[PDB]
Amino acid sequence: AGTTYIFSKGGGQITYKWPPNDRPSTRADRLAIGFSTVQKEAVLVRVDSSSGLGDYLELHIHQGKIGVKFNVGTDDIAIEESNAIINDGKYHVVRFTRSGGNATLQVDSWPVIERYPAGRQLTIFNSQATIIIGGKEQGQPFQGQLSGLYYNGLKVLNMAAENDANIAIVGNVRLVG
Amino acid sequence: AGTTYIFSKGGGQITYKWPPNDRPSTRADRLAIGFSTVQKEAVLVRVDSSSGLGDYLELHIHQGKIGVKFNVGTDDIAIEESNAIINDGKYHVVRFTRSGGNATLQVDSWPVIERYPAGRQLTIFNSQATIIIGGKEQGQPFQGQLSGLYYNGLKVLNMAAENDANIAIVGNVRLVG
Amino acid sequence: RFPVVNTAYGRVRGVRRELNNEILGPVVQFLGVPYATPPLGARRFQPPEAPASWPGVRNATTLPPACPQNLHGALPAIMLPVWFTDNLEAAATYVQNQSEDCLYLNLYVPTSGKKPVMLFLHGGSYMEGTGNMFDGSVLAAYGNVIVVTLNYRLGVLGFLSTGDQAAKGNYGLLDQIQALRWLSENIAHFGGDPERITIFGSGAGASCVNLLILSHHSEGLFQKAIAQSGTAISSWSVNYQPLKYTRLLAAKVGCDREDSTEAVECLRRKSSRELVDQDVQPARYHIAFGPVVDGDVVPDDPEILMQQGEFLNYDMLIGVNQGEGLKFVEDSAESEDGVSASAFDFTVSNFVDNLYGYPEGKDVLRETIKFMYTDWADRDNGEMRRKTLLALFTDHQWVAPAVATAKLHADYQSPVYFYTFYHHCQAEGRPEWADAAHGDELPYVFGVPMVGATDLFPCNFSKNDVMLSAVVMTYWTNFAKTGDPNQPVPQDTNRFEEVVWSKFNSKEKQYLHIGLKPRVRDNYRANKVAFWLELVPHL
Amino acid sequence: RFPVVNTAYGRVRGVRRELNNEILGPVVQFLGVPYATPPLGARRFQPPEAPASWPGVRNATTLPPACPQNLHGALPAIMLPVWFTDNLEAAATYVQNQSEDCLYLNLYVPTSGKKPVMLFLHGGSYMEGTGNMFDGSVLAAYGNVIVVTLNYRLGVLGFLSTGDQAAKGNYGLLDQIQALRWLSENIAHFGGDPERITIFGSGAGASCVNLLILSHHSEGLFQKAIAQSGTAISSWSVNYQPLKYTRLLAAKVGCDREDSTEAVECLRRKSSRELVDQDVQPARYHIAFGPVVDGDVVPDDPEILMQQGEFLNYDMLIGVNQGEGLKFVEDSAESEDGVSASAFDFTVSNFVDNLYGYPEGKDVLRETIKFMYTDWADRDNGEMRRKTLLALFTDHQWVAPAVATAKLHADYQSPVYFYTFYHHCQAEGRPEWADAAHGDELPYVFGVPMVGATDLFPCNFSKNDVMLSAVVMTYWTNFAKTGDPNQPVPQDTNRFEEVVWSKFNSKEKQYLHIGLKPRVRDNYRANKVAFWLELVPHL
Numbered sequence A, B: 001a002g003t004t005y006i007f008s009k010g011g012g013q014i015t016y017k018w019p020p021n022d023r024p025s026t027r028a029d030r031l032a033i034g035f036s037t038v039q040k041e042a043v044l045v046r047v048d049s050s051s052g053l054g055d056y057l058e059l060h061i062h063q064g065k066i067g068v069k070f071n072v073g074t075d076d077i078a079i080e081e082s083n084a085i086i087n088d089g090k091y092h093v094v095r096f097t098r099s100g101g102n103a104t105l106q107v108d109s110w111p112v113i114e115r116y117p118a119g120r121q122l123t124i125f126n127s128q129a130t131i132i133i134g135g136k137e138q139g140q141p142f143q144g145q146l147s148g149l150y151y152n153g154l155k156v157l158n159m160a161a162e163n164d165a166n167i168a169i170v171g172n173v174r175l176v177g
Numbered sequence C, D: 001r002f003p004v005v006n007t008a009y010g011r012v013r014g015v016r017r018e019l020n021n022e023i024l025g026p027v028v029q030f031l032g033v034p035y036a037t038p039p040l041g042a043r044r045f046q047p048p049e050a051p052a053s054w055p056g057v058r059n060a061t062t063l064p065p066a067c068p069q070n071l072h073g074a075l076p077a078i079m080l081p082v083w084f085t086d087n088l089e090a091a092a093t094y095v096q097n098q099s100e101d102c103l104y105l106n107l108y109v110p111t112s113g114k115k116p117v118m119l120f121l122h123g124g125s126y127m128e129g130t131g132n133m134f135d136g137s138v139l140a141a142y143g144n145v146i147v148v149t150l151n152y153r154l155g156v157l158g159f160l161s162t163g164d165q166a167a168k169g170n171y172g173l174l175d176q177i178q179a180l181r182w183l184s185e186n187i188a189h190f191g192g193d194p195e196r197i198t199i200f201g202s203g204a205g206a207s208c209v210n211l212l213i214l215s216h217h218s219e220g221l222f223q224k225a226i227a228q229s230g231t232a233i234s235s236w237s238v239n240y241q242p243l244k245y246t247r248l249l250a251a252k253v254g255c256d257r258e259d260s261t262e263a264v265e266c267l268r269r270k271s272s273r274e275l276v277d278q279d280v281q282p283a284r285y286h287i288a289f290g291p292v293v294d295g296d297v298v299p300d301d302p303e304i305l306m307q308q309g310e311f312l313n314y315d316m317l318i319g320v321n322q323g324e325g326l327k328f329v330e331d332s333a334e335s336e337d338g339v340s341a342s343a344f345d346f347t348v349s350n351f352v353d354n355l356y357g358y359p360e361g362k363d364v365l366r367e368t369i370k371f372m373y374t375d376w377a378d379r380d381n382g383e384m385r386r387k388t389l390l391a392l393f394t395d396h397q398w399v400a401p402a403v404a405t406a407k408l409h410a411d412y413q414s415p416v417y418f419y420t421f422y423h424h425c426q427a428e429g430r431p432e433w434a435d436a437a438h439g440d441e442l443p444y445v446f447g448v449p450m451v452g453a454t455d456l457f458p459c460n461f462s463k464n465d466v467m468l469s470a471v472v473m474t475y476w477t478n479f480a481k482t483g484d485p486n487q488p489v490p491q492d493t494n495r496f497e498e499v500v501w502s503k504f505n506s507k508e509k510q511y512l513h514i515g516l517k518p519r520v521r522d523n524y525r526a527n528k529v530a531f532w533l534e535l536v537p538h539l
Ligand SMILES: *[C@@H]1O[C@H](CO)[C@@H](O)[C@H](O)[C@H]1NC(C)=O
Pocket: A099, A100, A101, A102, A116
């Protein structure tokens, strides 16, 4: 486990706000996180576009199963590790590779669950605004520990621990160690 | 029997130009004129509208028959005295009364002839501009003697004999006495 | 004094009221002189006749009664002048003695040859108004002209018709023509000139002027016409469906016989109060009772009639205001912003259905007139949508017909002078964003600012208002005298001195922009006028 | 000297030509380095491959040969730049060494770290032009940037397609992408910055730039873009029926098979000169051979793709000139008066028939776009009808698509800077009434005023033109350096110092008005732009 940030009672949210003049857009998305919790329903990682754009990326645990749901503009595509229980209290790592509409999810060394959506789907994640971790505002606060957040060449917890000028943690989210 | 203007060899023309700010438009027309000639084909009185408007009134002798043709806007309504010959050298007086599309032509003491054109017809004679007597510019020069041209309370020949400013004499028009 | 004059029907004794202002001479007022027999019995729904001679001297000192009218009813509130509807309770003071024998008139003689006469045709709509409101005594003593006002039958008693010979209609127009005949044959005694008779009016009365030009009946009665804010070719100038409203009114009043003669005869036996006080609702932007195309007074459709030059070369002075559809935007005049985006395509849509309503196509017309009448540099201003709605109504109903009539009258070589009025009196109940509304030029023409605020015009008049009133009064009186607004009298008590009002040629549509900064412009709203005259017919 | 720089495929020898002017530093020119294998035989009608390494040092001192083309043939003369049509002989002087082996590019290194790179995508149309015509040496010496001008396959050899898999097409776009890849992975050796690469071109070449934005092939190759007088949504930007013209060319050349693969092979068996000289005429205001929507390089039509945010946030600098349809009115450009109405209506009807031609309705569209594009205040001018026709062509083809694509690129929070060019080089044959035409900003961007008149631009360039050119390249080089035309270098030798260029927000369409008298204006031709974008689709 890398830089471990804990989520205690009451929850919280850590936000990375991209600079207004340097908002990135990308065809392919990459995600990786090592989480430890027992919450049946929660939201761990949420990525939002700017104002007026419906594209979003959401990592959410529903009924104890973690899943990735992204809306790139046409429709929501959701992939879930349905045949696996993850909220056992241990440290579980997950990776999520996105390319166009296609998406692959890997858990530790367990077999990868892939998804190749049919039909015409959009491929661009337009003008990402903030990285949201904690999911309290959506309605599913996350209580647990998080480590090793990699997102398209960005290590969020690392530069959060490095006291970057565009990171804000509101709540009781404490650094482990 | 008043002022008499006699045409001579070649031809002549009398032009009355209404003032630009006092051009009359009338629903009723009266034209009385005494003439003496032996020409088979000629035109005596021609009244035209201003530039652009096709309204006109033309008194003409054709094949020994005297007739008036007027365009008030719909069609050239022409009434002709056919059961008589007038260019025999004797003095004659002709009167023409027009109301709307209806016309009445009288010569000497013979019974008047009435024209009552059928259908919807226009009435207003719009913006009379000039009076042409003799028709030198019309195409048929007139040779003879004319007297007492009465037109809607106006005597063109009477005004001509007093050196009217708007009256123009061009050609071989001669004054008796 | 107490002067008396000998008319062709007897002698009438008049009064000599002196005007308040120190720059105006005395005025002799002969109020109430009859001009026609009183249509009460079988003479109702019949054209008027000449009066009956009276032995002795008739007292003409008190204002005559007005014609029957239901002011507290379903009057068309769009075509009425703004000051009339604003001071509706004060206007009802003048119309209180409503009687069926209202056919009277009143002259205001003043005290370089003889004097010209100016008849005034009143009526914001065809069912209201009386000539006693406009005290044309300030105008008479200023321009040395004889101002005459009249009363004619209005509403059902005036314009009821069916189509056949049972009730031809247009009895109000015939009453106006009878008044003009009385002036023509009797004004010499009063000191006027019977061959220099101008006829002017504002609103629906102006429409009457533009119907007294295309009328066979009025040939030699007058010579000049001043039609301010009114045309004969707009949507509410004539009534093209008289039989429907006549039959509906007959059914409502108590008798609707299937034969026109029987129904008319039954109506003739009913009192004026029980049939004037009815409620007959016309379609929007139209009229129920008004002038009808019959064949006698109005030979044909005025739009068709005047395109073929069926007029006798009368000098003309047409005018409009900047914004006259001030009552079009009435449901959105007490809002901080203008109108909503969904409230801009609703008024325009209702406008389209009420006026055009073509089944061949209306999704092309609505879109193009919605695109044209919006400011694309301020697309989401809000206020500059109320402004454009007011401009849309003003352009469709008042400016385009006026320009069309001026062009069709100047095509046949008749001197037409066009004017646009921008200044207005700052009233109490009118919005600040608004501009010179319908009928807001009448106080200046009649010299109200030079006499002080009245019950009808409670506005505050400064020196600018008085100067503008004097200028417009001088222009109108010069037109009455000589048919040229600037010929006889130079401007006096300013930028009005060096401006020369030019004619209105159909090639270069020159006009005078009357206001606080007068200047002879070249084209008034060319884009929208051309849109309404030359593009809308193609769609 | 003769500097030698080692690339990733070998070593090249440049030159050190010194500019005519004084204040400009020396420029090192590597004229003629290759970037792809020459598509001569079987590789013809195939996407390019990486080059082949050479042993030793290769001369880079002479201008590389141009790709095959036919200047003295049947070309679309309506889309070509005015300076290219006027000086046809001086232009054909450059294209004399035409050969199928032409995939070479020229770099102009100057003499605050690594210098930015500016690629120039030339081409008035897709059938003509070469990179040797624009001496991008003054621009490099002024802005301290590295200008790279390339040569890519044009016409039949670069854009022939069948829709099938036998000939996908868009080989010119793939050549440009290969050149961008070469610059990205090789410009570090020349001192350039592989992370600040801009692409800028005029005319239909700028269209390529736009078509290079909606392609996933060019993902990280370039960071910015400057598209002047060109878009990917105008009528002549992409080819929508490539088979209809490929079959026509194959039939006219001698072999028209019914199988795509064998026809492609037969064409590959032909010589590069025989099929270039062949005349295939496209429909008016369209192109015969050009970019084709297949799914690999251009996934769908550029209008649909750019609406649903299919781009990766490239800083953008769009602009247009004031009047670009100077060759739309050329059949009636040498008359004392302008276009008679009988010919204005004919030209508008031909315009509608060629471009829209929609059978659903045309008697409505023609009338409304005739009414919109005429000034009713001076309707009978005649002379100022060429102006409205020029404005019609400029608005439909250039201004409206540029504004639409600027709004679409600015609706996804990507910087857009809008410019309008008014000044132009005073030529000899250019009419006095005409204003800055198509491609009349290229001399100013490239520093032609600061180096003197050349064979392509024979105008007399005064000090005003020198100052304007200095300011224009200052803006362009500032954008290349950082993406904001105001921050790097303050304006210096004037009205150009106090004006601050602002972004193009969709709500407030702010832009800068480059010309004699600059100004940061608020809306460019909002009426006509809104007419073409929001009303015509409803008709
Ligand atoms: C996504 O999957 C489809 C399924 O065949 C494939 O064609 C496509 O190439 C994939 N996306 C990418 C970016 O490779």
